[PDB]
Amino acid sequence: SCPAIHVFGARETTASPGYGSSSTVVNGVLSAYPGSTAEAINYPACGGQSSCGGASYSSSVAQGIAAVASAVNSFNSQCPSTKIVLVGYSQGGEIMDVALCGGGDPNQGYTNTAVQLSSSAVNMVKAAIFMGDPMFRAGLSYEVGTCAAGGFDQRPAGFSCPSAAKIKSYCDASDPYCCNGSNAATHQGYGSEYGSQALAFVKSKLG
């Protein structure tokens, strides 16, 4: 039976199968909405390490974009009136960003610039939370955080996401991968830092 709300979570590179650091927000949504359900996007979440199956970051990202699209598109067709929440942490944010906003991922060789979610799926995505997304580029309307630069896969100047209004994407200045800072620890802390903001946004969008 379809739930009223369903969440998809995508983990960061090398995280064990499941949600990884997307868990904070996924769990926040599930606890805010009893009866809601969640699934993890089971993409490689790899950067060449054997532990995660050896796929390069480029291959991992490409497979992740397709995995997000397939999972979300198929679930939407199964459950067309279910509101969808996306949560992606670091590489998991990147794959959701491409899938939802399109634009490709040129540094990763992901050449197709189309939105990968179906029209119906885009409409039922009501909130998408990205944390530590390497495609962060300061100046987009859907971004939050102290990062005034951008990450190693940053969107170009002048980018727009058709689904901007559905997104919050978080990144701080000191992060060396979504921003151009120097302290990797910042990259790991967005659940605690921004989880309440993210949940507030989700609740505002879901009702």
Show Cβ contacts of residue 5 under 8 Å, excluding neighbours closer than 6 positions: 29, 33, 35, 36, 37, 82, 83, 84, 85, 206
Across-strand partners of 8? Answer: 39, 86
CA distance 168 to 181: 21
Across-strand partners of 110? Answer: 105
Resolution in angstrom units: 0.9
Residues that are catalytic:
90, 175, 187
CA distance 160 to 143: 12
CA distance 13 to 115: 23
Across-strand partners of 37? Answer: 6
CA distance 48 to 54: 4
* Technique used by the depositors: X-ray
For the beta carbon of residue 37, count every other beta carbon within 10 angstroms.
15
CA distance 141 to 154: 15
CA atoms within 13 A on the CB side of 173: 2
CA distance 31 to 33: 5
Q: Which residue in this structure is represented by tokens 């998809």? A: 8
Which domains, and CATH codes, for the chain?
1-207 (3.40.50.1820)
- Let me know: does 189 contact 146? Beta carbons within 8 Å: no
Provide the greatest CA pair distance for the chain: 47
Q: Is 141 exposed, middle or buried (0-12, 13-18, 19+ CB in 10 A)?
A: exposed
